[PDB]
């Protein structure tokens, strides 16, 4: 992963001294450079991933709404059908009593 | 902010200067330091936000899975009731036809 804030800071402290040997300076600059390039790339991928997750979420919430409505319909069709025999039995007894 | 890679790079090039004046050296390092601290925080927020969304997705997934199960069970029970109505007619036929 990317440099911890304290490792980044330590590199800046090194660069503070103008008497730092040239090879140490250009090594430190390259370290900052590679780190930042990677960090930015990783951040941009995370942003792309986060956007796609937000679409997934909206879609799942809409599908969930659909199923909830679909479920309610089926439960209604079911409770209607469950009473048909009882409705028949009622009519049978009314007929028998007349 | 956060600095673009090429804006970051330009500060790295300033720090590659022999005769860089102390006050410019100091300002350039503070720019890197301030930028990195900010970037790290932004990145950590986005990481945490992403984790939150990934949990929300997993949950919506399960809730959808549950709805679809209950849907199939209500449809199954509807078919079971229709079968019962058919058996009722069959029993009635057996009694009528005597």
UniProtKB/Swiss-Prot annotation, chains A, B:
The keyword Nucleotidyltransferase does not apply. The keyword Mitochondrion does not apply. Keywords: Coiled coil, DNA-binding, Late protein, Viral capsid assembly, Viral release from host cell. It comes from Bacillus phage phi29 (Bacteriophage phi-29). Homodimer. Interacts non-specifically with DNA; probably binds DNA in the early stages of DNA packaging. This is Capsid assembly scaffolding protein. One of its GO terms (molecular function) is DNA binding. Belongs to the phi29likevirus scaffolding protein family. Scaffolding protein involved in the icosahedric procapsid assembly. Coassembles with the capsid proteins to form the procapsid. The scaffolding protein is found within the capsid as a serie of concentric shells. During DNA packaging, the scaffolding protein molecules are released from the procapsid. One of its GO terms (biological process) is virion assembly. GO terms for cellular component: viral scaffold.
